[PDB]
């Protein structure tokens, strides 16, 4: 069909939860020139455990990435999974 | 629906509920958004602890709204637990 398109005019700088979380994370740049957007920032949990009240890595809990299914352009529309940040999970549910 | 793909929403120390955001003039029509269940986080004894806060992790995502426009929208994907003491 006739598309008559018109042209119109880093997470570290937007949010610091990555550093303040009990399940902190680092942000890694995933580069791909054949994909739009070219750069995708992905969260990687710093520790296996979570940071407890005393400031130590506690292995009674785990840091886990929160992933979101997002559509990307490569043209072909593809579904990709990206880590947005980390949360802390425990084996006891209250 | 994220409940069928992942259950971290129920197992997290900063658990969350998923709310349906409906818009017929937007594609996708339905967007599931995370809402933190508590202000505090669940501690070692199973109680809501107010020495820490549950906070949403938001992601900037592009959405579609004869004429269409690509718009940037912010959505909560899940919650994390933050404390006022950084180690």
């Amino acid at each position, epitope marked *: 069909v006739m598309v008559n398109l018109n042209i119109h005019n880093n997470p*570290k*700088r*937007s*949010s*610091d*939860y990555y550093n*303040r979380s009990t399940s902190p994370w680092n942000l890694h740049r995933n580069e791909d020139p054949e994909r739009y957007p070219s750069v995708i920032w992905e969260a990687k949990c710093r520790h296996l455990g979570c940071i407890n009240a005393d400031g130590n890595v506690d292995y009674h809990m785990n840091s886990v990435p929160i992933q979101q299914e997002i559509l990307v352009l490569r043209f072909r529309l593809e579904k990709i999974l990206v880590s947005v940040g980390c949360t802390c999970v425990t084996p006891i549910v209250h | 629906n994220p409940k069928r793909s992942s259950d971290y929403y129920n197992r997290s120390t900063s658990p969350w509920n998923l709310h349906r955001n409906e818009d017929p003039e937007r594609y996708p029509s339905v967007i599931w958004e995370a*809402k933190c269940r508590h*202000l*505090g986080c669940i501690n070692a004894d199973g109680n*809501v*602890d*107010y*020495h*820490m*806060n549950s*906070v*949403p992790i*938001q992601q900037e995502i592009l959405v579609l709204r004869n004429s269409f426009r690509l718009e940037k929208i912010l959505v*909560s994907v899940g919650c994390t637990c*933050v*404390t*006022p*003491i950084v180690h």
Partner: antibody, heavy 118, light 111 residues
Framework: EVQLLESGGGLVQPGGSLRLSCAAS????????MSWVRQAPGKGLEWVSA????????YYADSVKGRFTISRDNSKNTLYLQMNSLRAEDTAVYYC???????????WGQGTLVTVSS | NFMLTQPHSVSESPGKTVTISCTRS????????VQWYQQRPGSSPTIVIF?????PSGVPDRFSGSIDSSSNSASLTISGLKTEDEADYYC?????????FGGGTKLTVLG
């Protein structure tokens, strides 16, 4: 360096309205809960209102419920306090404050003076 | 709701250790972090202590915070008291909805 710059203070008659602003810089604004605290001349500090980082949760002192509205614009790094139905007892210096978590304030602005008088 | 009670004024002599207490009327004090602010005349308050006992950079080692769950109170301790420590001191804490400041303590350095 954390900077919090309040504006909007002035003289208003009872029943009047005023909007205060607080422009923040030197930190990732959207990831911090914010609050307003006031101080009448020669008196103590009085908490007014608080708002979560996302703006999804708001909290108010009983003295200001139904009259004041706290809001924020995360794209502009600005905190607001819309003050309606003002009365003489609202006269004070209003301070913007950055909170590490709800109730833990780490930084204060310079304040803006609000005078409510006939 | 709850209240925080502080002494209206404290006078102490230089070089001594001064304690300013802050008693919570209702709710367990140990369930919520306590902050302490210093306010000099015509100035914005500055933080002295946050999260019960955290001292920010720039705050002298002479200032320390503590909590006593049995008495439901928090304390600000100033060791080696100096005349420059004269100011108003406020304690502050919260509950899941509200934030509350104590009435403030005027600290006078004698001699």
């Amino acid at each position: 360096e954390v900077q919090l710059l309040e504006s909007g203070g002035g003289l208003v008659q009872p029943g009047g309205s005023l909007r205060l602003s607080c422009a923040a810089s030197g930190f990732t604004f959207s990831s911090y809960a914010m609050s307003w605290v006031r101080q009448a001349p020669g008196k103590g500090l009085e908490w007014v209102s608080a708002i979560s980082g996302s703006g999804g949760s708001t909290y108010y002192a009983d003295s200001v419920k139904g009259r004041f509205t706290i809001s924020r614009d995360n794209s502009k790094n600005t905190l607001y306090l819309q003050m309606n139905s003002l009365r003489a007892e609202d006269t004070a210096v209003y301070y913007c404050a950055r909170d590490l978590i709800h109730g833990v304030t780490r930084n204060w602005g310079q304040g803006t003076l609000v005078t409510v008088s006939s | 709701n709850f209240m925080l009670t502080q002494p209206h004024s404290v006078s102490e002599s230089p070089g001594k250790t001064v304690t300013i207490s802050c008693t919570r009327s209702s709710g367990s004090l140990a369930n919520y972090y306590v902050q302490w602010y210093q306010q000099r005349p015509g100035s914005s308050p500055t933080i002295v202590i946050f999260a019960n006992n955290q001292r920010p950079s720039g705050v002298p080692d002479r200032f320390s915070g503590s909590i006593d769950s049995s008495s439901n109170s928090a304390s600000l301790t100033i060791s080696g008291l100096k005349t420059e420590d004269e100011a108003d001191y406020y304690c502050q804490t919260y509950d899941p909805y509200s934030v509350v400041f104590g009435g403030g303590t005027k600290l006078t350095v004698l001699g």
